[PDB]
Amino acid sequence: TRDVTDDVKSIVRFVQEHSSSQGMRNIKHVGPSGRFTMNMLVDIFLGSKSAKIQSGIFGKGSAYSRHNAERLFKKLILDKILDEDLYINANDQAIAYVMLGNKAQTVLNGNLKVDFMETEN
Protein backbone atom coordinates (compact mmCIF):
# COMPACT_ATOMS: atom_id res chain seq x y z
CA THR A 1 0.00 0.00 0.00
CA ARG A 2 1.97 2.98 1.38
CA ASP A 3 5.34 3.61 -0.28
CA VAL A 4 8.09 3.61 2.35
CA THR A 5 11.11 4.30 0.14
CA ASP A 6 12.48 7.64 1.28
CA ASP A 7 12.35 6.34 4.82
CA VAL A 8 14.23 3.17 3.96
CA LYS A 9 16.83 5.22 2.14
CA SER A 10 17.58 7.24 5.26
CA ILE A 11 17.22 4.32 7.66
CA VAL A 12 19.87 2.64 5.52
CA ARG A 13 22.08 5.67 5.27
CA PHE A 14 21.68 6.01 9.04
CA VAL A 15 22.57 2.44 9.96
CA GLN A 16 25.74 2.75 7.92
CA GLU A 17 26.63 6.18 9.27
CA HIS A 18 26.84 4.66 12.75
CA SER A 19 29.20 1.92 11.54
CA SER A 20 32.38 3.87 10.94
CA SER A 21 34.12 7.13 11.76
CA GLN A 22 33.94 8.43 8.19
CA GLY A 23 36.26 11.40 7.88
CA MET A 24 39.26 10.70 10.11
CA ARG A 25 42.08 8.89 8.26
CA ASN A 26 41.64 5.62 10.19
CA ILE A 27 38.09 4.82 9.01
CA LYS A 28 37.49 2.91 12.28
CA HIS A 29 34.49 0.56 12.53
CA VAL A 30 31.80 0.38 15.24
CA GLY A 31 29.86 -2.55 16.68
CA PRO A 32 29.13 -5.17 17.72
CA SER A 33 28.46 -3.22 20.90
CA GLY A 34 28.00 0.05 18.99
CA ARG A 35 25.38 -1.49 16.74
CA PHE A 36 21.63 -1.21 17.07
CA THR A 37 19.17 -3.91 18.03
CA MET A 38 16.03 -3.74 15.90
CA ASN A 39 14.28 -2.16 18.88
CA MET A 40 16.86 0.57 19.37
CA LEU A 41 16.29 1.39 15.72
CA VAL A 42 12.54 1.27 16.16
CA ASP A 43 12.84 3.47 19.33
CA ILE A 44 15.06 5.95 17.48
CA PHE A 45 12.81 5.96 14.45
CA LEU A 46 9.65 6.40 16.56
CA GLY A 47 11.10 9.54 18.18
CA SER A 48 11.13 7.61 21.50
CA LYS A 49 13.02 9.28 24.30
CA SER A 50 14.82 6.11 25.24
CA ALA A 51 16.52 6.41 21.87
CA LYS A 52 20.28 5.87 22.14
CA ILE A 53 20.75 8.34 19.32
CA GLN A 54 18.45 11.32 18.90
CA SER A 55 19.57 12.83 15.63
CA GLY A 56 19.62 11.44 12.06
CA ILE A 57 16.32 9.58 11.68
CA PHE A 58 15.21 10.44 15.20
CA GLY A 59 11.84 11.94 14.42
CA LYS A 60 11.05 10.28 11.10
CA GLY A 61 8.65 7.57 12.30
CA SER A 62 6.19 9.94 13.99
CA ALA A 63 3.47 8.88 11.51
CA TYR A 64 3.88 5.17 12.24
CA SER A 65 2.16 3.16 14.92
CA ARG A 66 4.68 1.33 17.10
CA HIS A 67 3.20 -1.85 15.67
CA ASN A 68 3.82 -0.77 12.08
CA ALA A 69 7.26 0.73 12.69
CA GLU A 70 8.26 -2.74 13.92
CA ARG A 71 6.80 -4.53 10.94
CA LEU A 72 8.60 -2.08 8.65
CA PHE A 73 11.88 -3.22 10.20
CA LYS A 74 10.93 -6.89 10.33
CA LYS A 75 10.35 -6.49 6.61
CA LEU A 76 13.53 -4.55 5.79
CA ILE A 77 15.42 -7.50 7.32
CA LEU A 78 13.32 -10.04 5.45
CA ASP A 79 14.14 -8.15 2.22
CA LYS A 80 17.84 -8.39 3.03
CA ILE A 81 17.95 -4.57 2.95
CA LEU A 82 18.92 -4.83 6.59
CA ASP A 83 20.37 -7.89 8.23
CA GLU A 84 21.21 -8.98 11.75
CA ASP A 85 24.02 -11.09 13.16
CA LEU A 86 24.52 -12.04 16.83
CA TYR A 87 26.71 -10.54 19.53
CA ILE A 88 27.74 -12.26 22.74
CA ASN A 89 28.68 -10.09 25.73
CA ALA A 90 30.85 -11.23 28.68
CA ASN A 91 27.81 -12.28 30.69
CA ASP A 92 27.33 -14.78 27.81
CA GLN A 93 24.16 -13.34 26.34
CA ALA A 94 23.29 -13.53 22.66
CA ILE A 95 22.12 -10.19 21.35
CA ALA A 96 20.97 -9.68 17.76
CA TYR A 97 22.17 -6.47 16.16
CA VAL A 98 21.25 -4.93 12.81
CA MET A 99 23.57 -4.22 9.86
CA LEU A 100 23.08 -3.52 6.14
CA GLY A 101 22.19 -6.41 3.85
CA ASN A 102 23.12 -7.14 0.22
CA LYS A 103 20.25 -5.14 -1.25
CA ALA A 104 20.69 -1.99 0.79
CA GLN A 105 22.99 -0.35 -1.77
CA THR A 106 20.27 -1.07 -4.30
CA VAL A 107 17.62 0.99 -2.50
CA LEU A 108 20.23 3.74 -2.18
CA ASN A 109 20.57 3.84 -5.94
CA GLY A 110 16.80 4.17 -6.30
CA ASN A 111 17.02 0.95 -8.30
CA LEU A 112 14.61 -0.51 -5.76
CA LYS A 113 11.41 0.98 -4.38
CA VAL A 114 10.02 -0.37 -1.12
CA ASP A 115 6.34 -0.78 -0.38
CA PHE A 116 4.74 -1.49 2.96
CA MET A 117 1.26 -2.63 4.01
CA GLU A 118 0.04 -0.82 7.15
CA THR A 119 -1.55 -3.26 9.63
CA GLU A 120 -3.77 -2.80 12.70
CA ASN A 121 -3.62 -4.35 16.19
DSSP string spanning 29-81?
B--STTS--HHHHHHHHTT-SS-S--STTTTGGGGS-HHHHHHHHHHHHHTTS
Round to whole Å and give the CA distance between 48 and 94: 24
Fold of 1-121: Arc Repressor Mutant, subunit A (1.10.10)
Mode of pairing for the β-strands spanning 2-3 and 115-116: antiparallel
Under 8 Å between Cβ of 75 and 116: yes
Could you count the other beta carbons within 10 Å of the beta carbon of residue 71?
A: 18
- The resolution in Å comes to 2.7
What residue spans define the domains of the chain? 1-121
Breaks (C-N over 2.5 A) in the chain follow: none
